[PDB]
Amino acid sequence: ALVKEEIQAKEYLENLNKELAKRTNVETEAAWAYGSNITDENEKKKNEISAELAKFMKEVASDTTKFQWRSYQSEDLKRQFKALTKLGYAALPEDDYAELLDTLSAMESNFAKVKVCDYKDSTKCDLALDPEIEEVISKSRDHEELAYYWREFYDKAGTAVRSQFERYVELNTKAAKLNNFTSGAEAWLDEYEDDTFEQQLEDIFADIRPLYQQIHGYVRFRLRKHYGDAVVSETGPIPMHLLGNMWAQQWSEIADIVSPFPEKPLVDVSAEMEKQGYTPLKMFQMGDDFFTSMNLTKLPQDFWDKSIIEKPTDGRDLVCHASAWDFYLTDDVRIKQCTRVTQDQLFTVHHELGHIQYFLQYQHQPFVYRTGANPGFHEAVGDVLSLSVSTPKHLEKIGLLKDYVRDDEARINQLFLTALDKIVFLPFAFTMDKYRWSLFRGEVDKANWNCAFWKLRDEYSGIEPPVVRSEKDFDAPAKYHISADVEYLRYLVSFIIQFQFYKSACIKAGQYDPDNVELPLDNCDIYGSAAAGAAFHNMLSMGASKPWPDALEAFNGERIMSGKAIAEYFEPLRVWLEAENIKNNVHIGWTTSNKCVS
Amino acid sequence: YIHP
Ligand SMILES: *[C@@H]1O[C@H](CO)[C@@H](O[C@@H]2O[C@H](CO)[C@@H](O[C@@H]3O[C@H](CO[C@H]4O[C@H](CO)[C@@H](O)[C@H](O)[C@@H]4O)[C@@H](O)[C@H](O[C@H]4O[C@H](CO[C@@H]5O[C@H](CO)[C@@H](O)[C@H](O)[C@@H]5O)[C@@H](O)[C@H](O)[C@@H]4O)[C@@H]3O)[C@H](O)[C@H]2NC(C)=O)[C@H](O)[C@H]1NC(C)=O
Ligand SMILES: [Zn+2]
């Protein structure tokens, strides 16, 4: 009978969760070793452990059918059993799973191993994306130099793995269908536990899109004054290599040439960080300080002993794309970051430490609940702190911003600088998964795969490649997450919900009042706030034990993902920018790009 | 868990 079985099932879950944590620890260790030190030996080891764990997962999914779990009284037990039925890639036949793993590591290792030749010196061909190529993209204002580095990187990180990417799509689709999702798109979307999630995002994106259009138009206007009309047209998409980022995902690196008020202060603390002798260790210690100041959890000794916070100086290949790692024991959490002493990197440190804090907050939960309420929640945590860290308020406290006068013009500069990160990123993030969804769903013929990518980048972001591309090129995998098979919608969700978290944290901290001119949202610092920290504790400690609206409710009493908070943050900028574009007769919108030949 |  069922009452006796449900008692038996509870004990089954308790043991199985612990077993899964321990087995995942072993896989995670091998994945960490490979990412920290890319070799054929470490690749083989990583993939073989994964194959072994996949086999065990198959038996787990099979064993769930021995329990009448859908009949149980406990919502908690049912939720745990449902999580265990979800096999993902592990649903694939043994041989197919091994091939997928080989395909995945081929793409990630290709990306990580990319090296290009110096623009000025064809002798020197050891320039990696991080830091050599990214240094040029962010700092050079030589448009032909920029175009050279763009072409070299995309050819090597993108085009080189076309055939591998094609097989990856095939096996991803096969895995999804074995789990009875239509495609990998539905498999990914399942993490949000909401059958209207795509529509919800379309609705939020549509509300914020007009503001992006205004920012786009103004940036294009300002770039025309810098580079001239031969380089930048008034009516066409912006040549993406001029935007200070390899993927044009955020434009803050060109703030010095596009800022609303160039005679007024623009916050860029990198030089002061260097002058004051900042190190990666110091930056991580400061991040730790921020969390503990909020009455949240101190980094454990294992973090300091085991993390990699600087790029290794030996010859070795590794993945430098910053990541945070949970090892599923107690207090074994780590970051791998090729840390540089810059303002942007100080934000990255806090972002990654946001993941770490989430790990620590839910490590007491059963294994299946030791993950984010949804993938967007995990990406949001550290960004909430980074929003505070970025304020003139906070940066003056820590002595990184000197002689700053916060008048109306300086406020617009700072709001615009933030928007160059936060608003600009939204269409970018949406396209990363719109693209992959369309391939997963079989909506694009293989003959049209590359221009389908650039079509989306044009349609949503109004950017284009510096040179003519065709179906001979394959540019999508030049973005880390695409080569590494990391879902990207999490970041769109994050950039929306992080403002919901920030607004509420600021209100709880007594740092934001919409009717008090002295407490604007865009200068809120939650440092030292135990009240803000309590909200984080309430939400993060839940892990994935409840559907995400319950996790949001625990933070601030709300249950709905909403664009209200992000729009509220940028409202003063919207008012000023709409008026400034009219004043300057700024053309808005763009013609269809000519940069991808069919 | 990776950076954007
Ligand atoms: C993705 O969707 C797939 C469907 O599109 C799905 O695949 C199906 O899974 C079913 C398992 O639940 C499976 O059903 C079994 O079928 C057996 C016979 O099937 C054969 O003939 C079919 C053609 O007629 C072929 O297509 C097949 O390939 C097979 O050759 C049955 O013998 C079997 O029965 C037993 O089990 C039932 C279920 O019992 C349940 O649990 C308790 C017992 O513990 C019961 O008290 C309770 O009432 C409940 O019903 C018993 O009732 C029965 O007495 C037998 O013991 C069973 O019906 C089906 O064959 C399979 N394929 C297809 C094409 O339908 C995948 O599982 C989905 N994948 C995921 C991950 O969800
Ligand atoms: Zn992240």
Author numbering:
A (entry chain A): 17 to 614
B (entry chain P): 3 to 6
The article reads:
Peptidyl dipeptidase A is a highly glycosylated ectoenzyme that cleaves dipeptides from the C-terminus of a broad range of oligopeptides. AnCE is a single-domain glycosylated protein that closely shares enzymatic properties with human ACE (in particular the C-domain of human somatic ACE) and is inhibited by classic inhibitors of the human enzymes 14–17. In this study, we elucidate how the natural peptides Ang II (the principal end-product of the renin-angiotensin–aldosterone system), Arg–Pro–Pro (the BK-derived peptide) and bradykinin-potentiating peptide-b (BPPb, a snake venom inhibitor) bind to the active site of AnCE, revealing novel interactions involving several enzyme subsites. Comparison of the four structures clearly shows a common mode of peptide binding to AnCE.
The co-crystallization of Ang I (Asp–Arg–Val–Tyr–Ile–His–Pro–Phe–His–Leu) with AnCE resulted in conversion to Ang II (Asp–Arg–Val–Tyr–Ile–His–Pro–Phe) which can be observed in the substrate-binding channel. In the AnCE–Ang II peptide complex structure, clear electron density was observed for the tetrapeptide Tyr–Ile–His–Pro. In the case of AnCE–Ang II peptide complex, the observable part of the Ang II peptide docked with residues P2, P1, P1′ and P2′, occupying the S2, S1, S1′ and S2′ subsites, respectively. In this configuration, the peptide could not be cleaved, suggesting that Ang II is a true competitive inhibitor of AnCE-mediated conversion of Ang I. The C-terminal Pro residue (P2′) is clearly visible and anchors the peptide at the S2′ subsite by hydrogen bonds with three residues (Gln265, Tyr504 and Lys495), whereas the pyrrolidine ring is stabilized through hydrophobic interaction with the surrounding aromatic residues (in particular Tyr507 and Phe441). The main chain of the His (P1′) residue from the Ang II peptide makes hydrogen bond interactions with His337 and His497. At the P1 position, the Ile residue is involved in a tetrahedral coordination with the zinc ion and stabilized by a hydrogen bond with Tyr507. The visible electron density terminates at the P2 position with the main chain of Tyr strongly interacting with the main chain of Ala340 (through two hydrogen bonds). The hydroxyl group of Tyr interacts with Thr387 of AnCE. Ang II is resistant to hydrolysis by AnCE and repositions itself in the active site so that the penultimate C-terminal Pro residue shifts from S2 to the S2′ subsite after the hydrolysis of Ang I. Based on molecular modelling, we predict that the C-terminal Phe of Ang II could be accommodated in the binding pocket. The crystal structure of AnCE in complex with Ang II provided direct structural evidence for Ang II being a competitive inhibitor of AnCE activity.
